[PDB]
């Protein structure tokens, strides 16, 4: 099925998933000069102190850090949202080179990686139902640039050799995702989609203005992961990003001047 290679990558996805050419696909380029400041946009409310991480999984396209979402433990509200959204997992997209890796771009500029914290709207009861709704998900996107290390990321980096290949998982309890956040919660927001198949148009994107910096060693270790399963020929997990998609009718709003 689908992947990030020349024969199964983003240019191929529309054959299995026609919505790939839809009207609200993600990611997009964020043209900062055309995004309009909205003084009515509320501050984001990120309540992560009761977050309960469980497990980290190599699913063959990225690694997911999963949380207990059976209860309102770690939630996203406010900002452009009018509901409560539970954190279910986070993951990254990254490049083979420091100059590429992010899915969203800012004035056509690419970051080395992008963090997605994935939340679903509790009025729909579970994640499976939520992705079938236009307002089912809220994804907090955070850019990574290469520079100084991010201490709050190191526990993630540390465990990656225990989940080198597709289908491997490891215990990952007591991880605090607050350690992955930049100082500012200033953001851009627009309506979009999952950036991987099935590419459902169910996401309110909230992309933070301020990137976090990670060390070259930290992203280096991301790139030692494998797309393949154990015992299969090694394919390095790199360049697992979808490129920017046409903005079409949409307007990106900024929480800040
Ligand atoms: C339809 C549905 O129930 O979930 C959508 C898909 O995605 C999640 S995921 O936990 O791996 N993950 C969720 C959303 C992530 O999208 S992201 N890149 O835009 O915000 C990527 C994959 C799972 O992989 C599911 O197997 C897969 O079906
Ligand atoms: Zn993602």
Swiss-Prot record:
Enzyme type, top EC level: lyase
Effect ascribed to mutating residue 64 to Q: 2-fold decrease in enzyme efficiency, as determined by kcat/KM ratio, and efficiently inhibited by chlorzolamide
Residue ranges of domain Alpha-carbonic anhydrase in the record: 1-256
Control of this protein's activity: Activated by X-ray, histamine, L-adrenaline, L- and D-phenylalanine, L- and D-histidine, L-His-OMe and beta-Ala-His (carnosine).
Residue stretches in coiled coil: none
A GO MF label: zinc ion binding
pH dependence: Optimum pH is 6-8.
Cofactor details (free text): Zinc. Can also use cobalt(II) with lower efficiency, but not copper(II), nickel(II) and manganese(II).
Catalytic activity: hydrogencarbonate + H(+) = CO2 + H2O; urea = cyanamide + H2O
Active site: 61
GO annotation, biological process: angiotensin-activated signaling pathway; carbon dioxide transport; morphogenesis of an epithelium; neuron cellular homeostasis; positive regulation of cellular pH reduction; positive regulation of dipeptide transmembrane transport; positive regulation of synaptic transmission, GABAergic; regulation of chloride transport
Listed result of changing residue 195 to S/V: Reduced activity
PROSITE patterns per UniProt: ALPHA_CA_1, ALPHA_CA_2
Positions of substrate binding: 195-196
Clinical condition linked: Osteopetrosis, autosomal recessive 3: A rare genetic disease characterized by abnormally dense bone, due to defective resorption of immature bone. Osteopetrosis occurs in two forms: a severe autosomal recessive form occurring in utero, infancy, or childhood, and a benign autosomal dominant form occurring in adolescence or adulthood. Recessive osteopetrosis commonly manifests in early infancy with macrocephaly, feeding difficulties, evolving blindness and deafness, bone marrow failure, severe anemia, and hepatosplenomegaly.
Complexes and interactors: Interacts with SLC4A4. Interaction with SLC4A7 regulates SLC4A7 transporter activity. Interacts with SLC26A6 isoform 4 (via C-terminus cytoplasmic domain).
Protein name per its UniProtKB record: Carbonic anhydrase 2
Species this protein is from: Homo sapiens
Upper lineage: Eukaryota, Metazoa, Chordata, Craniata, Vertebrata
């Amino acid at each position: 099925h689908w992947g990030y290679g020349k024969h199964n990558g983003p240019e191929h996805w529309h054959k299995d998933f026609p919505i790939a050419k839809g009207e609200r696909q993600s990611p997009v380029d964020i043209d900062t000069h055309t995004a309009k400041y909205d003084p009515s946009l509320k501050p984001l409310s990120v309540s992560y102190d009761q977050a309960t991480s469980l497990r980290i999984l190599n699913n063959g396209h990225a690694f997911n850090v999963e949380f207990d979402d059976s209860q309102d433990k770690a939630v996203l509200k406010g900002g452009p949202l009018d509901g409560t959204y539970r954190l279910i997992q986070f993951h990254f997209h990254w490049g083979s080179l420091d100059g590429q890796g992010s899915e969203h771009t800012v004035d056509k500029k690419k970051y080395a990686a992008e963090l997605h914290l994935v939340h679903w709207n509790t009025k729909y009861g579970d994640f499976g139902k939520a992705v079938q709704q236009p307002d089912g998900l809220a994804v907090l996107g955070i850019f990574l640039k290469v520079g100084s290390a991010k201490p709050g990321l190191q526990k993630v980096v540390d465990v990656l050799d225990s989940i080198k290949t597709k289908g491997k998982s490891a215990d990952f309890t007591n991880f605090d995702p607050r350690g992955l956040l930049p100082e500012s919660l200033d953001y851009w927001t627009y309506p979009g989609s999952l950036t991987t198949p099935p590419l459902l148009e169910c996401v309110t994107w909230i992309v933070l203005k301020e990137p976090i910096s990670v060390s070259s060693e930290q992203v280096l270790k991301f790139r030692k992961l494998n797309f393949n399963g154990e015992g299969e020929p090694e394919e390095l997990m790199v360049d697992n990003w979808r490129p920017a998609q046409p903005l079409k009718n949409r307007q990106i709003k900024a929480s800040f001047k």
